[PDB]
Design a protein around this ligand. Structure first.
Ligand SMILES: Cc1cc2nc3c(=O)[nH]c(=O)nc-3n(C[C@H](O)[C@H](O)[C@H](O)COP(=O)(O)O)c2cc1C
Ligand code: SF4
Ligand code: SF4
Ligand code: SF4
Ligand code: FES
Ligand code: FES
Ligand SMILES: [Ca+2]
Lengths: 156, 148, 905
């Protein structure tokens, strides 16, 4: 069902060259598969385990330990709004309410068209410019609930 | 720095070999704890380790390992370019050198400024952060992040 | 070292942690994540004590006793109020999410979490919010999974992965949703997965085989017994209820199998509860099967035996020493035959000669873990002697232990040791006809036919010692690997040479003996281990006798017209056609057995012998250790018409009826005295266990716990009148609660571990001199022979290399932990776990035959054409064909034999 692409295999092996032990490339191998396919499916655990020479239980433990390695299907874009305390003071709840009322989903859910998945993340290290959001790779700061219906429509 | 000979093999003709990698994380707050950092570096779950042994004797892959913050290593080059006496003669406090300090959260100017140790929190909040915003009364503060 | 616990002065070992030091002193500290065999990690935070800086300190500090060295001049308090409050708080935090499951949980009354909940005195719930829940996984036929009951103590993963080197169990997830299981549903693949049910302090991992016929630990009738499923002789506690064998628990033995069994021994007891077992003596007259009682069975058998001219007896390596000896006395020494084939007997007595005349110390199973280099020659140890493979894994991790000891890291601090010794390990070189389960930790694996394995052993011996015979025709690459092995073995302080009789090759055993002798001549502390085939293979070899072919010849020639077969099916050691013809020729066949075998159709008389659960006896280890097993239950307590006697009792009463025409149901100690009087090599079996007159301050040893229930009800459907308690004249155990099972009683045989406040397998702490050490008054069992003063000579019979000849196919043996051993593969829970019958082929030979993977091929062996589907074996060599030994129809005497007319069916 799952077979690693050639570019994924070369990227994983190149990451394995960087470390004394090949086990140390597990996080980056999972991130490589996730970057190529949106998330890490079930067969990717065994494929990465075979490439790295570690058990599949270790790969699954690493993949389910880290929050940013997705072991369930996500949408085309992952919205990650900050949940922590400075953005709580700066009013992240209005941003979360605006995102929920636009996308008609709860946090942790994906829209019916597969465009967005909404997730609360921890502090994005941008607390002096809060509240903060992270759509796929872009960090959007100084958020207002009125700017959500324009920010979300530039991610097709 | 590698193309300029500052990294790699035979740095500045001294024979010292140093290779610098950038390992991007996958999002856990416990990964910053140094022994859990070492465990995540080794491709494991980021559980911390009991000390002793400290990572200086048995760290990453059982080798001598030193974990330091970004800002400590950024303090190092000024120390070695200007001297010990200069680093000890910029603040009359028991904590030597300068520190990045800053106020955040519903102040006029939330931000980050490099200040000597012994700078009071009031002068940071008023002179640098601009005081609290309009129509807001100061009721509490955390000095050093969410764990203080 | 001097410690002060609650102001009381104690002398401890300074290299221990405070938790194990205090548990060894009899103090109680609650704990979850620590185990004596796994080391200390400091996870559960339960074992907190209060440490003071000196005697004049009152504040103190809460420390973890498992992570704190018990150094000289230590001051701690267990009964400190703040420490007690913290320990109760830890139990409370574990209780917040714990399911309301104790009545419907197989761990109840045997649960360590229950014990530590009560011990901290936490009985009031003030948590009012929701409990987290978990879905369960299917872990196969042996282990049941209930992740709700988990306390995240991490014992399971640390055992299964860092101790047993299993790969398919792990921890997943995060903060409070931490999950312990497989990455997906499926059978747990470790051969030692069954130890999870005792390692797990809660009811997450439970014995599914016990769960089918569940009963609580107080309702169990236990006895100390020896596992019958291979030669390693791990001590077990079988427990019964309502006349059926319910469970096999690990019985602690700090010299043999301390905390762990393999899965074959733990789950292969199901043959004892088979409904087709003989329960009465049955005589075949024409087509009629008359049921007899004991007395008239002996009278009729003695009459027919008296009228016959020659009577021969065929023993078995399944039977105890007493049963084989009683048969040998009934038929005479000259008419007694061991039930194994001639090649098996040759290999067994050669291994015995190496063990008791080779001058090289043979280690116990626990001592195997301390060796510095291992060479396994010809033995599939994981499939034939599995607990030795687990001990070999510990010996391999010894290098990381030494590396961490070099950095002054304490030996209980397991995580630091494993971090220091990352992938470094002691050298392991395994040799087999194919890949083994030890190949993950093996420095090198040699896949070759048994002649080439023997030649590699002979070459290693010659390279170590030039006086050893040389091998001609070694390839340069194989020579380089030989020098790798020789440099590893010569550089070790304690090399260990493992071989055995299961390879089917005498030359492999000879090569192993040559390597051990060469290492001994260089001044090394070399040990040698020989893995036998069955529970009493070494005892049957020590007693000796003719081979099965000689007995069949005596039956076929008509010189013997009566044969008494003891606990032997005769088809695993000879061809079924020849055995059936020889037994049909004999006018009197008497089979004494506890299982329904195929030769009972030809049997004129069948005596319902007892299995190990219903009998007492002595079995000899693969290391020569004589161990007594004790009867668990009386089979006639529930079924009054059951006549299921011990085999030695049957044969002794038959001998008495043959001589003096009166029966004599003897005693076990009389038979043991007869053994030690008649066979001086077996004289050590007298000291294996004390005799039936042994008492603890005048009272016997109790087989069942003090809270054993249902005394006036368990038999009330049969009759409301309570029957007499079954008397035990053979042993020092009583069939009741009216006895002793104190942890401080001066004895070595402990039927089960229980102490007040310790209802779990953690109660074994109270029965040991120090935790994880020996039993307090010595582990049971005695070594029959000491190490010889002088060794053997070198075996100069170096074989030629294997040559694939056309038309003939050398049978390569494949052993399975589930399937090869006879009695355990008769157990019904093993059939799902048993591999399907697959004949293994090289890709080249399969392409030569025009056969793909899965197509069925037919071959004729001894005139019997059988058909099996093909599995392609990459690691096998050409000209060899792989067959699963011990399965249905594939007798283990096929190892090393040749095959003809292999063609697609
Ligand atoms: C839970 C936890 C999280 C931590 N996260 C970080 C971190 O993100 N970055 C960091 O520099 N130190 C972090 N630390 C502190 C480190 O353990 C360590 O003190 C530091 O990284 C290196 O020491 P230094 O201050 O001398 O450079 C964390 C500590 C704990 C207990
Ligand atoms: S694991 Fe122990 S405490 Fe939990 S339900 Fe089972 S018996 Fe009760
Ligand atoms: S499953 Fe059992 S052994 Fe594993 S962490 Fe949970 S309680 Fe401990
Ligand atoms: S290794 Fe052998 S003796 Fe030990 S439990 Fe397994 S089958 Fe029984
Ligand atoms: S609290 Fe939101 S960016 Fe730090
Ligand atoms: S037993 Fe010491 S912390 Fe678990
Ligand atoms: Ca008895």
């Amino acid at each position: 069902a799952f077979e690693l692409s050639a570019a994924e295999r070369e990227a994983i092996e190149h990451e394995m060259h960087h470390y004394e032990d090949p086990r140390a490339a597990s996080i980056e191998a999972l991130k490589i598969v996730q970057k190529q396919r949106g998330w890490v499916p079930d067969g990717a655990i065994h494929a990465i385990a075979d490439v790295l020479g570690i058990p599949a239980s270790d790969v699954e433990g690493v993949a389910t330990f880290y929050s940013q390695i997705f072991r369930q299907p996500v949408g085309r874009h992952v919205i990650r709004y900050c949940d922590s305390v400075v953005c709580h003071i700066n009013g992240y709840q209005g941003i979360q309410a605006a995102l929920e009322k636009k996308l008609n989903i709860k946090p942790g859910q994906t829209t019916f068209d597969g465009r967005f998945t909404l997730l609360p993340t921890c502090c994005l290290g941008n607390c002096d410019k809060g509240p903060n959001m992270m759509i796929d790779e872009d960090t959007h700061a100084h958020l207002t609930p009125e700017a959500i219906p324009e920010l979300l429509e530039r991610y097709k | 720095a590698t193309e300029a000979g500052l990294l790699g093999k035979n740095i500045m003709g001294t024979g010292f070999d140093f290779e610098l990698f950038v390992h991007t994380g996958a999002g856990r707050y416990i990964c910053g704890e140094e022994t859990a950092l070492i465990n995540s570096l080794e491709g494991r779950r980021a559980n911390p380790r009991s000390k002793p042994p400290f990572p200086a004797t048995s760290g990453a892959w059982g080798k001598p390992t030193c974990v330091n913050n970004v800002e400590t290593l950024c303090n190092v080059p000024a120390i070695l370019a200007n001297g010990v006496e200069w680093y000890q003669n910029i603040s009359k406090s028991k904590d030597a050198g300068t520190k990045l300090m800053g106020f955040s959260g519903r102040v006029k100017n939330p931000g980050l400024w490099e200040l000597p140790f012994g700078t009071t929190a009031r002068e940071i909040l008023e002179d640098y952060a601009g005081g609290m915003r309009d129509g807001l009364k100061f009721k509490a503060w955390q000095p050093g992040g969410a764990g203080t | 070292a001097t410690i002060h616990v609650d102001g009381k002065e104690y002398e401890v070992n300074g290299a221990d942690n405070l938790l194990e030091a205090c548990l060894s002193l009899g103090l109680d500290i609650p704990y979850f994540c620590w185990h004596p065999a796994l080391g200390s990690v400091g996870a559960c935070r339960q074992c907190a004590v209060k440490q003071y800086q000196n005697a004049e300190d009152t504040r103190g500090r809460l420390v973890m006793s498992c992570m704190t060295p018990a150094s000289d001049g230590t001051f701690i308090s267990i009964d400190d109020e703040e420490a007690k409050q913290f320990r109760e708080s830890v139990v409370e935090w574990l209780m917040t999410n714990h399911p309301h499951d104790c009545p419907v949980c197989e761990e109840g009354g045997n649960c360590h979490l229950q014990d530590m909940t009560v011990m901290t005195g936490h009985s009031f719930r003030r948590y009012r919010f929701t409990k987290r829940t978990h879905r369960n996984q299917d872990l196969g036929p042996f282990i049941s999974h209930e992740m709700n009951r988990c306390i995240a103590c991490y014992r399971c993963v640390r055992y299964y992965k860092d101790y047993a080197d299993g790969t398919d169990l792990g921890v997943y997830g995060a903060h409070d949703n931490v999950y312990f299981g497989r990455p997906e549903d499926g059978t747990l693949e470790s051969e030692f997965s069954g130890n999870l049910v005792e390692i797990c302090p809660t009811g997450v991992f439970t014995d599914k085989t016990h769960s089918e016929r569940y009963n609580r630990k107080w309702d169990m009738q236990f006895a100390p017994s020896i596992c019958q499923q291979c030669s390693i002789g791990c001590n077990i506690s079988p427990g019964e209820r309502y006349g059926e064998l319910r469970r096999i628990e690990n019985r602690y033995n700090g010299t043999v199998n301390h905390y762990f069994l393999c899965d074959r021994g733990r789950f292969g007891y199901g043959y004892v509860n088979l409904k087709d077992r003989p329960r009465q003596p049955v005589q075949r007259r024409g087509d009629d099967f008359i049921t007899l009682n004991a007395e008239q069975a002996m009278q009729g058998a003695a009459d027919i035996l008296r009228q016959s001219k020659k009577v021969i007896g065929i023993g078995s390596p399944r039977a105890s020493v007493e049963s084989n000896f009683a048969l040998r006395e009934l038929v005479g020494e000259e008419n007694f035959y061991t039930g194994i084939a001639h090649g098996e007997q040759e290999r067994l007595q050669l291994a015995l000669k190496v063990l008791r005349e080779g001058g090289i110390y043979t280690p116990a199973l626990r001592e195997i873990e301390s060796y510095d280099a291992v060479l396994v020659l010809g033995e599939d140890v994981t499939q034939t002697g599995a607990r030795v493979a687990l001990a070999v894994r510990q010996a391999v991790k010894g290098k990381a232990r030494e590396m961490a000891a070099a950095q002054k890291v304490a030996d209980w601090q397991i995580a630091a040791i494993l971090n220091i010794g990352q992938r470094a390990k002691h050298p392991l070189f395994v040799t087999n006809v194919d890949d083994t389960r030890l190949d993950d930790i093996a420095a090198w694996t040699y896949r070759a036919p048994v002649e080439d394995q023997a030649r590699l052993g002979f070459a290693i011996a010659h390279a170590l010692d030039n006086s050893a015979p040389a091998v001609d025709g070694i390839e340069p690459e194989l020579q380089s690997k030989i020098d790798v092995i020789v440099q590893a073995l010569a550089g070790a302080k304690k090399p260990l040479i493992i071989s055995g009789t299961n390879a089917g090759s005498l030359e492999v055993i000879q090569a192993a003996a040559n390597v051990a002798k060469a290492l001994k001549g260089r001044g090394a502390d070399v040990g040698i281990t020989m893995i036998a085939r069955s529970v009493n293979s070494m005892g049957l070899g020590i007693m000796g006798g003719g081979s099965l072919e000689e007995a069949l010849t005596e039956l076929e020639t008509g010189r013997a017209d009566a044969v008494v077969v003891l606990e032997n099916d005769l088809h695993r050691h000879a061809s079924a056609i020849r055995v059936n013809a020889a037994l049909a020729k004999a006018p009197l066949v008497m089979v004494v057995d506890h299982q329904r075998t195929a030769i009972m159709e030809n049997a004129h008389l069948v005596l319902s012998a007892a299995s190990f659960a219903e009998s007492d006896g002595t079995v000899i280890n693969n290391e020569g250790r004589a161990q007594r097993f004790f009867q668990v239950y009386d089979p006639a307590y529930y079924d009054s018409k059951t006549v299921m006697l011990e085999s030695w009792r049957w044969l002794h009463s038959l001998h008495s009826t043959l001589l003096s025409r009166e029966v004599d149901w003897t005693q076990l100690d009389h038979v043991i005295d007869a053994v030690v009087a008649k066979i001086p090599e077996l004289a050590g079996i007298k000291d294996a266990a004390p005799d039936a007159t042994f008492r603890i301050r005048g009272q016997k040893l109790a087989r069942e716990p003090h809270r054993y229930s249902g005394r006036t009800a368990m038999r009330a459907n049969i009759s409301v009148h309570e029957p007499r308690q079954p008397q035990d004249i053979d042993t020092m155990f009583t069939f009741s609660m009216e006895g002793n099972n104190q942890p401080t009683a001066h004895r070595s045989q402990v039927p089960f571990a229980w102490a007040p406040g310790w209802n779990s397998p953690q109660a074994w702490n109270k029965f040991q001199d120090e935790v994880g050490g020996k039993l307090r008054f010595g582990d049971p069992g005695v070594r029959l022979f000491e190490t010889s003063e002088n060794g053997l000579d070198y075996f100069t019979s170096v074989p030629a290399r294997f040559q694939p000849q056309d038309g003939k196919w050398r049978i390569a043996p494949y052993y399975h932990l589930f399937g090869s051993d006879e009695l355990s593969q008769r157990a019904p829970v093993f059939q799902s776990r048993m591999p399907q019958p697959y004949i293994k082929l090289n890709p080249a030979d399969a392409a030569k035959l025009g056969v793909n993977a899965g197509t069925r091929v037919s071959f004729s062996y001894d005139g019997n054409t059988v058909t099996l589907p093909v599995e392609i074996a990459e690691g096998l060599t050409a000209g060899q064909v792989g067959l699963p030994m011990g399965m249905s129809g594939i007798a283990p005497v096929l190892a090393g034999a040749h095959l003809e007319d292999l063609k697609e069916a």
